[PDB]
Amino acid sequence: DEDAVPTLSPCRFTGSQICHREDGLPLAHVAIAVEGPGWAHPDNVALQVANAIIGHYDCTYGGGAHLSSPLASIAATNKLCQSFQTFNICYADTGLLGAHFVCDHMSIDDMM
Amino acid sequence: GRQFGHLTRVRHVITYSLSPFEQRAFPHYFSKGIPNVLRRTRACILRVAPPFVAFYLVYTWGTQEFEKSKRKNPA
């Protein structure tokens, strides 16, 4: 031990966009998130509950129209995606909270 | 017509952007700003300016000839 043992410095969350346009690939991938609090924070539980309500979807799920989650349900009936998943990624004092989806070029807007 | 998603084919182009709430609306406004307007001016004077002075001149001469004409010495 002794000298040469540093801690972790906080990481500024920015909030921006990176778009890698590539019309050669057949389905678009999009990932959007706000800054979450870190591992320690008590409120990761309420976030996970809300995320669960939104849930996830995939084109192989049985139950389309009748799924509880309105996103899932509207996505299945209107065929707005191939898959989507909410997430709550945790790091020291920060995190990414949001969702990721995969869809046809003409469905990115409705999906968002 | 038109729409988005049916415009044209684009590949291999990344676009980094930043939220409007994280950047300034007027970065080097006077610093980079004024040099640019001077540069834009240089680029265009020789194409915009001349026609106009030709009129400016034709205007002042045209007025002088007219007013000086309604006067007369002998005969």
UniProtKB/Swiss-Prot annotation, chain A:
Compartment list: Mitochondrion inner membrane
Q: Which domain of life is it from?
A: Eukaryota
Its annotated function is as follows: Component of the ubiquinol-cytochrome c oxidoreductase, a multisubunit transmembrane complex that is part of the mitochondrial electron transport chain which drives oxidative phosphorylation.
**Stated family:** Belongs to the peptidase M16 family. UQCRC1/QCR1 subfamily.
Spell out the subunit comment: Component of the ubiquinol-cytochrome c oxidoreductase (cytochrome b-c1 complex, complex III, CIII), a multisubunit enzyme composed of 11 subunits. The complex is composed of 3 respiratory subunits cytochrome b, cytochrome c1 and Rieske protein UQCRFS1, 2 core protein subunits UQCRC1/QCR1 and UQCRC2/QCR2, and 6 low-molecular weight protein subunits UQCRH/QCR6, UQCRB/QCR7, UQCRQ/QCR8, UQCR10/QCR9, UQCR11/QCR10 and subunit 9, the cleavage product of Rieske protein UQCRFS1.
* The name this protein goes by in its record: Cytochrome b-c1 complex subunit 1, mitochondrial
Its taxonomic path starts at:
Eukaryota, Metazoa, Chordata, Craniata, Vertebrata
Gene coding for it? UQCRC1
Q: Which residues of the full protein are shown?
A: 258 to 369 of 480
Curated annotation (Swiss-Prot), chain B:
Q: Name one GO biological process term.
A: thalamus development
What Pfam families does this protein's entry cite? UcrQ
Q: Where in the cell is it found?
A: Mitochondrion inner membrane
* N6-succinyllysine carried by residues: K32
Q: Which residues cross the membrane?
A: 39-67
Q: What is its main location?
A: mitochondrion
UniProt keyword Electron transport present: yes
Stretches of the chain found on the membrane's Mitochondrial matrix side: 1-38
Q: Which keywords label this protein?
A: Acetylation, Electron transport, Membrane, Mitochondrion, Mitochondrion inner membrane, Respiratory chain, Transmembrane, Transmembrane helix, Transport
Matches recorded under InterPro entries: Cyt_bc1_su8, Cyt_bc1_su8_sf
Task: Identify one Gene Ontology CC term for this UniProt entry.
Answer: mitochondrial inner membrane
Topology term for the membrane: Single-pass membrane protein
Residues modified as N6-acetyllysine:
K32
Family the UniProt entry places it in: Belongs to the UQCRQ/QCR8 family.
Assembly and interactions? Component of the ubiquinol-cytochrome c oxidoreductase (cytochrome b-c1 complex, complex III, CIII), a multisubunit enzyme composed of 11 subunits. The complex is composed of 3 respiratory subunits cytochrome b, cytochrome c1 and Rieske protein UQCRFS1, 2 core protein subunits UQCRC1/QCR1 and UQCRC2/QCR2, and 6 low-molecular weight protein subunits UQCRH/QCR6, UQCRB/QCR7, UQCRQ/QCR8, UQCR10/QCR9, UQCR11/QCR10 and subunit 9, the cleavage product of Rieske protein UQCRFS1.
Query: What PANTHER family does the entry give?
Result: CYTOCHROME B-C1 COMPLEX SUBUNIT 8, UBIQUINOL-CYTOCHROME C REDUCTASE COMPLEX UBIQUINONE-BINDING PROTEIN QP-C
Biological role stated in the UniProt entry: Component of the ubiquinol-cytochrome c oxidoreductase, a multisubunit transmembrane complex that is part of the mitochondrial electron transport chain which drives oxidative phosphorylation.
Q: What is this protein called?
A: Cytochrome b-c1 complex subunit 8
| Source organism | Bos taurus (Bovine)
- Organism lineage string: Eukaryota, Metazoa, Chordata, Craniata, Vertebrata
